[PDB]
Amino acid sequence: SHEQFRAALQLVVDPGDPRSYLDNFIKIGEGSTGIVCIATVRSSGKLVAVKKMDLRKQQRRELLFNEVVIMRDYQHENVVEMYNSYLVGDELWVVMEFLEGGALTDIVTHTRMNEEQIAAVCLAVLQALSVLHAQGVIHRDIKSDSILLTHDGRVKLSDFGFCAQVSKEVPRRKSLVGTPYWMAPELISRLPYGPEVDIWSLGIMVIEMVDGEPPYFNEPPLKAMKMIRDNLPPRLKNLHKVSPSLKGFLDRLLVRDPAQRATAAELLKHPFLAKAGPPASIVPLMRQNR
Ligand SMILES: CCn1c(=O)c(-c2ccc(Cl)cc2Cl)cc2cnc(Nc3ccc(N4CCNCC4)c(F)c3)nc21
């Protein structure tokens, strides 16, 4: 049953105990699939992040493979770097880069962002999504919560628990996964869907950065989901705070027809993204700076 998973892991993971070089573990967080900790590296004095998870008590064990097997070795400035993974008892530990700035979701709830800062975030996420989409990877869970910030103000994509690899021969997936408010129409349709569901989800994230919340966030998840499927492209509640430039950009992401919805490739050219400021424009927005 479970020790078949254990055995496959032992192919992948680096062997040996990461306690041979890691200590002063401290809990950051948790999102059901495991606990997450900060730990110090003895040899060098640096901090890392460590996701730990017991193999037996995982329920969508399938997904546990997807982060490790996909995320292992993708080189990208705007993606969260995995260092190693280890088998430690009946537990998988994954060691990652530690982003000091935390999630963007902390920022969008408390403050409102200007367009320079919005453009930067979008730029970073589109750079990363273009490559991931250039190698078959649909993230399938884009939202402010899965964006992390360095102290420099750099933006990196993470939280690949739900990602899926896709190819020339089977170019779509069926599986109903994601966060409701952020899921595309076709995904709730139970239709086959491609790497464009990232783009809709991104659009919903822009509405997060401008409004503070996504559409229908008052509703229950089941209500909101028919609403996104059935009804029109949702709209910015604060349309008046927003450029015609950004408004255009946004109208090319929230296309309900998937066919004519735009692409990381395409969107990387748009005039909206030339407003993007450097990493330093983002710093002030953080909790140490607020
Ligand atoms: C659970 C978050 N998390 C991960 O899950 C992972 C991760 C994801 C998938 C895998 Cl396979 C392994 C890991 Cl290791 C990496 C990670 C790296 N850096 C950070 N930085 C960080 C800094 C401060 C805060 N907060 C400030 C204010 N209030 C809430 C606490 C914060 F939420 C986050 N978080 C990561």
Question: Are 30 and 122 in a shared domain?
Answer: no
My answer on whether 107 and 88 are in the same domain is no
Q: For residue 100, which atom of ligand 1 is closest to its CA?
A: 22
Q: Give residues (CB < 6 A) around ligand 1.
A: 28-29, 36, 49-51, 67, 80, 94, 96, 98-99, 102-103, 106, 148, 158-159
Q: Which domain holds residue 138?
A: 99-290
Through-space distance between the first and last CA atoms of the chain, rounded to whole angstroms: 50
Q: 14 an active-site residue?
A: no
CB neighbourhood size of 147 (10 A): 28
CA distances from 220 to 62, 142, 178, 203 (A): 27, 20, 15, 21
Helix H or strand E encompassing 96: strand 91-97
Amino acid at 229: R
Q: Residues 19, 158: one domain?
A: no
Calpha distance 178→187 (Å, rounded): 9
Q: Which two structure tokens, joined as six digits, stand for 85?
A: 């993974």
H or E element, residue 200 = helix 197-211
**Residue among 190, 186, 244, 178 at smallest CA distance from 214:** 178
**Long-range CB contacts for residues 209-213, cutoff 8 Å, separation at least 24:** 209/104, 209/108, 209/113, 209/117, 209/118, 209/121, 209/144, 210/112, 210/113, 210/118, 210/236, 210/238, 210/241, 210/242, 210/246, 211/236, 211/237, 211/238, 212/108, 212/109, 212/112, 213/109
Residue located nearest, by CA, to atom 2 of ligand 1: 29
Q: What distance in Å separates the CA atoms of residue 204 and residue 236, rounded to the nearest whole number?
A: 10
Q: Answer yes or no: are the C-beta atoms of 102 and 287 closer than 8 Å.
A: yes
Give 123: exposed, middle or buried? Use CB within 10 Å, 0-12, 13-18, 19+.
buried
Q: Final residue of a domain: which of 98, 120, 143?
A: 98
Q: Whose CA is nearest to atom 4 of ligand 1?
A: 36
Residues 118 and 76 reside in one and the same domain: no
Nearest partner of 139 among 124, 120, 158, judged by Cα: 158
Select from 184, 201, 219 the least CA-distant residue to 144.
201
> How was this model experimentally determined?
X-ray
Torsion of CA 192, 126, 63, 151, to 10 degrees: -160
Give the distance (Å) from ligand 1 centre to CA of residue 99: 7
**Are 88 and 132 in a shared domain?**
no
Distances (CA, A) of 53 to 34, 50, 159, 177: 5, 10, 15, 20
Q: What's the CA gap between 25 and 16, in Å, rounded?
A: 18
How many angstroms separate the CA atoms of 35 and 173, rounded?
Answer: 29
Do the Cβ atoms of 228 and 215 come closer than 8 Å?
Answer: yes
Which of 225, 279, 230, 273 lies closest to 100 in space, CA to CA? 279
Q: Within 13 A of 256's CA, how many CA atoms are on the CB side?
A: 12
Phi, psi of 205 (to 5 degrees): -70, -40
- Name the resolution in angstroms: 2.5
